[PDB]
A paper describes a structure:
By comparison, the structure of the Fc fragment in the IgM monomer is similar to that of the pentamer, but is more dynamic in the Cμ4 domain. We then modified the Cμ4-Cμ4 interactions and captured the ‘closed’ and ‘open’ conformations of IgM Fc separately.
Immunoglobulin M (IgM) is the most ancient of the five isotypes of immunoglobulin (Ig) molecules and serves as the first line of defence against pathogens. Natural immunoglobulin M (IgM) assembles into monomers (composed of two heavy and two light chains), pentamers and hexamers.
Author numbering:
A (entry chain B), B (entry chain A): 345 to 556
The structure:
Amino acid sequence: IRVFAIPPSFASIFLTKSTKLTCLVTDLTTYDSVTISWTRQNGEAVKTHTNISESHPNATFSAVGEASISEDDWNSGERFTCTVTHTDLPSPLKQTISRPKGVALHRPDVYLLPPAREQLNLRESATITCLVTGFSPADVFVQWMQRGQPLSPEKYVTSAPMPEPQAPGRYFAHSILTVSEEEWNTGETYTCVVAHEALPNRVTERTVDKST
Amino acid sequence: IRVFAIPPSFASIFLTKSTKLTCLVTDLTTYDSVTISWTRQNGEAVKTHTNISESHPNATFSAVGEASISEDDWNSGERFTCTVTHTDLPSPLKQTISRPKGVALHRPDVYLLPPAREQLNLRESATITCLVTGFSPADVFVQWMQRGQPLSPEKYVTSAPMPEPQAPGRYFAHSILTVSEEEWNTGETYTCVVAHEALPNRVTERTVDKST
C-alpha cells in the first residue's frame, strides 16, 4: 500500500522551462473511481490533472496526475502533496514532497575525452566520453549536440550521479557516445552540454575534434 | 516473506579460487532456532555452514550459510537450493539457484584512457579510465595494480555491467582511479587487469604512463 510521487528533476525543468509535479499509485489492485488532486502547504488546490493512466499487468494499479507550478515556490521548499482516494482505504493517503536548500551548491567542471588511439585500429567504432566532476546537489542534465542539432537519445548512455570517495558530499557522472571512425576522423564535433543549477547561466559547452 | 540467495560471482571465484554458495533471509521477524542446509539436485547434503549472522535493526531477520563446491558442477548448471526452517511458516521454503550456458561467451576488449590535458592545470587531481567493451555474460572483475602491488578498493570506483545500445546482447563497464598529478606526471603506472570467463587465461593487463 504505497503511492510514490516524482519530484521534478532539474533535467526536465531545464528541458521544458516549466515545472510539473507527478505522483503515481502502486501496491494496490486495479479498480476505478479514483480522483487525484494536488494540495499545497496552505491548503488551496491547483490546476486539474490530465492523461488518466492505465493499470499495470502485475496486479498493480497506478494513477498519474499533473500540476503546473512556478519554480520559485518549489525552489523555496513549499510543502506539496497530491491526494489519492480509493475504496479499501478508509482515509485518503497523503504523500509529502519537498526539496530543501541546505544541500551544498558547488559548480561542476566539464571534461571531454577523445577515443583511444588503439581503438581506432579495428576501424569499427569509436567512443567519446564527457566527464563531469564536483557538483552538489545530485541533479544534473547532459545532452549531446551535433552541428547545432540535438542527437537522438538512443546513441549515448548517461551514468547516474554517484559520489566521489575523496569528498564528504560531492558527485560525478559520465556519458559516452558511440560513433563511426570515418565520422570521428573525418566528420564533425559532438559537443556535450551540461546544465547544473549551480552554474551562472545553467549552460556549459565543450568542443572536441580530431585535431585537439 | 522472502529468502534471497547469492549465486557466486565470477569476481569472487577468480579472486579466491574457491566457489561458495550463499543465501540470506529477509522479510521475517527476528527469532531463533533456525537451521540452514544446502541440498543439491540429487538430494544429498554438503558441508555445514558457519558464521551465524545477526538480525537487521529494521524488523528483519537474516541468516547466512556457506557451502564449498567444485566449479565444474556450477558451470554445468546443477540445481542447488538451501533449506530454511522457521516457526510461522508451515513448510520450509526452497530457493532455486542455477547458472545457464546459452548466454553468449564473447571475449571483451580493454582500453585505458589517460587524463585530459586540461585537468592537469589545476594541479589538484587526475583521473584514469579503464574501459571494457563487448563481453557476455554479465560477470566481470576489474582491479587496479601499482608496481605489482594491489591498491586499496577505496581509491577507485567500478561501474556495473550495462548493455550497449548497438547490440542485442553485449555489455560494457567502466572504472576510474583518482591520483595526484605529481604522481601521474612523475610516479608509476597503474595497470588495470580484468578477468572474464570468456578469456583464454582469464587475465588481461594493460599499461599506461605519462609518455604513451
